Write a protein that binds this ligand. Structure first.
Ligand code: NA
Ligand code: NA
Lengths: 519, 104, 103
């Protein structure tokens, strides 16, 4: 381990071995000094115009962190295509992480003149929250992950966290965490860091779409032996009185047939069209938003439980806050136009999951008698019911991979709503920080903590290797399947490539459900 | 006791890469018509941020204050009680599912 | 067609690049890829050793053969050498077909 010796090589590749695929990606990173080496209490109350739904109390820290919770951090577009076009499923098995070729640079600023040089003896500090003692900030769809394109140099995100709050104030249970309290490895140029991790057992992601629907599992050609109430009143003319008539469900009465299952849970969202002219002329994104109520404040149930984005022929419709939406390259942070973002679609699950913008179904609302007509009620919120079956939200090339399951007494189907794998012991948080280097101190002793430091930052490479287990497709479907494919005809540029300006871009969201499977 | 809340698990300092519908109508004056505007959740919009979880189940109970003067003047302990209906008879869902006794 | 040996598995391409070294980054996080780098270049030596197999000549031709030869008489400079300015130059193209062979 010396100044003149590399401490690691560039490992970027993918190998397919059978029921496994191993991805490996390396990137060059840059880490500045955050918070001026300080920890700062940050808060936001209800003063000014800040609403109560957005209050918070927490801290910003001088630390940065590595994040690769995004599929494109590991799969190239072509690899993603190889995965989704041929496998009914897949899942993470184990990973290796490495930090190397570290270099700490210090910048001198005198008379407009700026010079940067190495500080051969400075160190960075690194450690993993292997015992999950820090607030788990990963799994919240934050920016700062390794770039999709291998040639892009990225900046390391700053670590910050939240605790309990009451307005802009802290409460008795509010917790303060000092990351310097943890043992951490100190590396100088020449030193490297690495660790291994094994994923817990988790189900394969459903990278397939159903080629059958819950309400169409019977034999088209045979009647049931079971009967259903088919008539409640006579029909012979005008002397119509009450009676009781029963019939057997059959090919023409599939909606009446007795069935064994029920569609998945529902939490109805407001519908909105991509054809603005068809929408009400008001600003309802928030006022008509589907939300949950937690201790006084409201949050969008975004994207909320997995529901079909729209029913047959209505591609223009989508749940106001019930789908993942990515931005196109350079889309504005605020009020970006529809043509600057990319809406995803969980259309593939219409097959088992209720459509996100409609009722779950209908229930009786009273007791009918001869003097009281029967009444019905529309169900727009339907929790788990015995016999329900459903699918989870799909995952995307540019979407999240996993999330830490909250440590609670209970929960229900812990599949992270934004999509992905829910893990009790997810990949550990990897914290990194440039060690503060005092600028000359006074010549006579003083109690005060130093606050004058040499200006510096660090850079180096990072590698992440993940082994994935594949669940091969075993279909007897005779006719060809749907497959993700590149466009055929000429185009100004190549999809999933760089610009004349060297800018890489992801033209569209790529899901995972192309192959089909029976129910 | 948890020292964090379900709706405050993100990093206070970083924006999401995910967007949410932020605007449905223009704002420039009185010619306001429908439009579509999207934004990225961030430190000041934590209520809008995409999240992975939902709060536990609910079965709303009637509230009552220990300051009698703030309560309706009637005997509602039973009539306004949260109950379940089993074969013709009703029982108080007491104490029922676990829910926070009160907010801040 | 330009001449030479056609190979299905020719010597591999050898790619080289200077690793980008970020110039100081901003002090508060930003999504954008860095675009400010320290200006640098690299230098070093490179060696290539190739072993060639020769097919010796086995001719019974009685009379001398044609041979590539340096010019005999005086000249301003030496062919295949440097200038008074230190510039090396190849005065002419030199082929390979001097010895002869029957059909
Ligand atoms: Na493509
Ligand atoms: Na010569």
């Amino acid at each position: 381990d010396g100044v003149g010796s590399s401490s690691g090589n560039w490992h970027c590749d993918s190998t397919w071995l059978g029921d496994r695929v191993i991805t490996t990606s390396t990137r060059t990173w840059a880490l500045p000094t955050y918070n001026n080496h300080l920890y700062k209490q940050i808060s936001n109350g209800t003063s000014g115009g800040a609403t109560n739904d957005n209050t918070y109390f927490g801290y910003s820290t001088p630390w940065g962190y590595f994040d690769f919770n995004r599929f494109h951090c590991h799969f190239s577009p072509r690899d993603w295509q190889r995965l989704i076009n041929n496998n009914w499923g897949f899942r993470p098995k184990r990973l290796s992480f490495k930090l190397f070729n570290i270099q700490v640079k210090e910048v001198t600023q005198n008379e407009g003149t700026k010079t940067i040089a190495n500080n051969l003896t400075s160190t960075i500090q690194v450690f993993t929250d292997s015992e999950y003692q820090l607030p788990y900030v990963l799994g919240s769809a934050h920016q700062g992950c390794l770039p999709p394109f291998p040639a892009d140099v990225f900046m390391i995100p700053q670590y910050g966290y939240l605790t309990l709050n009451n307005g802009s104030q802290a409460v008795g249970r509010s917790s303060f965490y000092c990351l310097e309290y943890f043992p951490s490895q100190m590396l100088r140029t020449g030193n490297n860091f690495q660790f291994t991790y094994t994923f817990e057992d988790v189900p394969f992601h459903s990278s397939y779409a159903h080629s059958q629907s819950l309400d169409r599992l019977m034999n088209p050609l045979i009647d049931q032996y079971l009967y259903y109430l088919s008539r409640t009143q006579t029909t012979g003319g005008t002397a119509n009185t009450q009676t009781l008539g029963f019939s057997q469900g059959g090919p023409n009465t599939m909606a009446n047939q007795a069935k064994n299952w029920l569609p998945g849970p529902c939490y109805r969202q407001q519908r909105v069209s991509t054809t603005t002219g068809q929408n009400n002329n008001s600003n309802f994104a928030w006022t008509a938003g589907t939300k949950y109520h937690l201790n006084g404040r409201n949050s969008l149930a975004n994207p909320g439980i997995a529901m079909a984005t729209h029913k047959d022929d209505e591609e223009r419709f989508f749940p106001s806050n019930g789908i993942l939406i990515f931005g196109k390259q350079n889309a504005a942070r605020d009020n970006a136009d529809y043509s600057d973002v990319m809406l995803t679609s969980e259309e593939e699950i219409k097959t088992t999951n209720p459509v996100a913008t409609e009722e779950y179904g209908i229930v009786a609302d009273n007791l009918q008698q001869q003097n009281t007509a029967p009444q019905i009620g529309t169900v727009n919120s339907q929790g788990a019911l015995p016999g329900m079956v459903w699918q989870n939200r799909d995952v995307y090339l540019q979407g999240p991979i996993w999330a830490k399951i909250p440590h609670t007494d209970g929960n229900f189907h812990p599949s992270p709503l934004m999509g992905g794998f829910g893990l009790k012991h997810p990949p550990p948080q990897i914290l990194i920080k440039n060690t503060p280097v005092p600028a000359d101190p006074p010549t006579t002793f003083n109690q005060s903590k130093l606050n004058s430091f040499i200006t510096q930052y660090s850079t180096g490479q990072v590698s992440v290797e993940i082994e994935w287990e594949l669940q091969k497709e075993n279909s007897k479907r005779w006719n060809p399947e749907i497959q993700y494919t590149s466009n055929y005809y000429k185009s100004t540029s190549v999809d999933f490539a760089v610009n004349t300006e060297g800018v890489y871009s992801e033209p569209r969201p790529i899901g995972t459900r192309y192959l089909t499977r029976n129910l």
